[PDB]
Every structure is written in C-alpha cells, then in structure tokens.
C-alpha cells in the first residue's frame, strides 16, 4: 500500500480524494481545476502537486502536446521540490517524470532524473536497472555495463539485469560470455525479461559459436509472440505483410524501378567504380558486427529517406536516376547504397530490423564464382545488370570467395502492401 500522504496531507485527505476521483473519472477539465484549487490553497502539499501533475500528464495525453507534457514533467519535478515528500510519492513522481521524458524522446533528461532517483534510493535495485536503460537509450553502453555489473554484484539472480548485461556483452562481440546471461535472464521470467530483443540476440550468439541450441530459443521467442516466425525475427514490424524470403519484381509491383536499374546498370556501375578509384574513403566499413571475417564496405547515397549531398556529388547521374522513384528515396526504413565485398568475406547469418522494407540488389561487378547469398533456406547468385529481391527481415548469409571484388547496388523499397499513410508515419529506422 503506497504511502503518499505526509503529515499535513493527512489533514486534507478528504479534498485530495474528492479531486483524485474527478481525475479517475476522466474529467481532466474539472480535476485540473480542483487540484489547482488545492495547490493554491495548500501550496506546499506534495499530494495536491502530484494530482496536478497527473492531470497535466493526462492533458498532454488528450491534446498530445510536447509543451503540455513538458509542463507535467516540471510538475512531477515540483512534487520532488516541495518539503516533506513521502518516499513512495517521491519515487512515483520522479519515475513517471523519467518515463514521460523517454516517451517524448528526451533521453538526456530522463537520464538526469534516473541518476537523481538512484542517489535518493541507493538500495532500490529496480531503480538501478532503470538507470541502466537510460544509459542504453543514449548509446552509453560503457556506463550501462557498469550499472548492471553493480546490480548483479548485489542481486546476482536479477533476471532483468542478467538479460541486459548479456545484451551489452553480445553487442560488444563477447559472444560466448554473453550466452549464459541472456539465457538465465530469459529463464528467470522476471519483469522486463520477456523481450524479443534478448531472444533475438541469444539465438544469434549461439549460431556464431556453433551451438545448435540457437533455434530452440528462436522457437521460444516465436512462442511468446516476439517474432513473426522462426525464420523472420525482425522486431520493428507491421503485422499483416506478406512474408517470403525471395521476391520476384512482378510480386513486388516495383517493375518500373527494376527496369530502370537494369536498363541503366552500366552508368550506376561506372559511377561506383569511379568512387572506388578516386574517392575510396567514401566507402565505409560495415559497422554492425555482422562479419565473421573479410572486407566489406558501403557507400551510401540515401539513408532514412534523406539524400547525402556530398555522396551524390560522387554519383550524380545515379542519384538523378533514383530521384524518380520515391518508393526508394522516401523509404525511411531503408538505404540506397553501393556495397563492395572482397574475397575471404563471410557475413554471419543475420536479420534486418524491420519487415517494412524489401531489399533490391543490382549486380554491378560479379565474379563468375565464389559469391553467393542465402535467404532463409535458399542460396542464390547475383548477375551483372540483374536485380535480386529479398526480404532481409528473414535470416540471410553471404559469402565472398572469388579472386576479385564483388560490387552491387542496394536499393531498399517500402514493402508494397504498406499504405501511403504508414509510409508517411512509420518512425525512421
């Protein structure tokens, strides 16, 4: 039973309760006014202030307003800034402040609140876990790692901390070390461990280490609703999209884009070769830990539906050609990029992040042997001047064992069943 009333608030419990009921009945108009009256009347009351804040939070809900939620965020702050605040209320107010900052996208602010909460409550392990999430959300994996090490050193059986530690290890390429934490944290059944993010990476770590256990966990993750299937493990999905590893141009409906890519393939090729020759630094090494070995770099013209101006100065005719196809230049969950892969390269089995795109590959320079790509259970080969199309939300794997480089052009398109509105609204990836 949360203890939200300090000594003075116990003396006005009747007014506080009456006002809370108006909020719980959806009369945010009246509830805001009643809690406002209580804040004026009792400017030091934490519970009155928390009521005001909760109603501001709800008002930002209804009107869906960043200024509104920012006000509520200060009011949760205000609750914490009043005198004699009960510990349970202090924790609730600041936790919700951090959460609403995150929900809005103010990850830096959330982090500040979370550090404060841990200073105020040094024995609360769930707060420490929450702080680790804040660090992860700003991309500060080093600090996240220390936080979860501290949690485990005190509560080594904490499943939430186990999965998150294993996530960080896996992301750092500590594959084997990562496995027991992901497995044990999932197996804990603790709150926050039933997350597809941990099934995905536990299986992937196992595959990299040649431990056949991997698909067991994939199946479990699909049993608990996290994956579309065992073979299609993407996590930013729109359910109801046709799912097949390999597509024909006709099936995708983007027949005109395929035609343009194939009819004009030599211009695309030549511009990529010219960049390889005179501006090779524009090709950046793949940086998502997908390679077992080998050299693989990409020269990106579009990402998240934004043209890279410098890059397109290097492939101007190709960018001009592509500009006619908003299905790709506006695919905010895909890229348009040259990709060069050299002999001795093996890309681990891997999965893209979203089922909202299909991936086209146009062959530009393809050695006669040694290059291949598997999607799901089928392995295929590229052809110079020809487009392959696959759904990279399915497990896929690539090998390069030729005696010279392999150059392709990668053109991501919106999944064709996605509606115009979805294409305008889906967050960019």
């Amino acid at each position: 039973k949360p203890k939200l009333l300090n000594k003075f608030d116990k003396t006005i419990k009747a007014e506080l309760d009456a006002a809370e009921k108006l909020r719980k009945r959806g009369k945010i108009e009246e509830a805001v006014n009643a809690f406002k009256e209580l804040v004026r009347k009792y400017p030091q009351s934490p519970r009155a202030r928390y009521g005001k804040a909760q109603c501001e939070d709800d008002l930002a809900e209804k009107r869906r307003s960043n200024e509104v939620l920012r006000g509520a965020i200060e009011t949760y702050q205000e609750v914490a800034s009043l005198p004699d605040v009960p510990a349970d209320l202090l924790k609730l107010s600041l936790k919700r402040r951090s959460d609403r900052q995150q929900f809005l996208g103010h990850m830096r602010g959330s982090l500040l609140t979370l550090q404060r909460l841990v200073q105020l409550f040094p024995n609360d392990t769930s707060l420490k876990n929450d702080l680790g999430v804040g660090y992860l959300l700003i991309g500060d994996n080093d600090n996240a790692k220390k936080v979860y090490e501290e949690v485990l050193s005190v509560t080594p059986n904490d499943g939430f901390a186990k999965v998150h530690y294993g996530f960080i290890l896996k992301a750092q390429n500590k594959i084997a070390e990562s496995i027991p934490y992901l497995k044990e944290g999932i197996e804990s059944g603790d709150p926050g461990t039933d997350d597809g993010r941990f099934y995905f990476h536990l299986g992937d770590a196992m595959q990299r280490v040649g431990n056949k256990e991997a698909y067991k966990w994939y199946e479990l993750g699909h049993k608990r609703g996290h994956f579309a299937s065992v073979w299609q493990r993407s996590l930013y999905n729109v359910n109801g999209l046709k799912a097949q590893p390999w597509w024909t141009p006709k099936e995708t409906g983007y027949t005109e884009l395929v035609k343009s890519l194939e009819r004009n393939w030599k211009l695309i090729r030549d511009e990529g070769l010219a960049v390889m020759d005179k501006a090779k630094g524009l090709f950046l090494p793949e940086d998502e830990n997908l390679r077992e070995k080998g050299d693989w770099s990409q020269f990106t013209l579009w990402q998240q539906g934004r043209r890279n101006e410098n890059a397109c100065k290097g492939a101007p005719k190709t960018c001009t050609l592509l500009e006619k196809f908003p299905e790709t230049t506006g695919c905010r969950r895909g890229q348009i990029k040259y990709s060069i892969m050299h002999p001795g390269t093996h890309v681990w089995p891997a999965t893209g992040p979203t089922n909202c795109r299909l991936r086209m590959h146009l062959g530009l320079v393809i050695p006669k042997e040694g290059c291949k790509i598997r999607c799901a259970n089928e392995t295929k080969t590229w052809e110079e001047g020809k487009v392959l199309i696959f759904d990279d939300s399915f497990e896929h794997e690539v090998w390069q064992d030729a005696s010279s480089f392999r150059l392709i052009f990668i053109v991501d398109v919106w999944h064709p069943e996605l509606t115009p509105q979805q294409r305008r609204s889906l967050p960019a990836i």
Binding site: G105, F167, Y236, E288, L290, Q303, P353, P427
Partner: peptide
C-alpha cells in the same frame, strides 16, 4: 543510441521517439 540499425538489429532501440 547514437548509432543506427541499417543492415542489422544491434542497437538497444532502432528508432527515435518524439510524440503521440
């Protein structure tokens, strides 16, 4: 996360949130 999920799914979150 100050890195992006392009070919894979390696980041803790792949999107930036901002509103309702």
């Amino acid at each position: 996360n100050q890195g992006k999920c392009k070919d894979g799914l390696g980041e803790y979150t792949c999107t930036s949130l901002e509103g309702f």
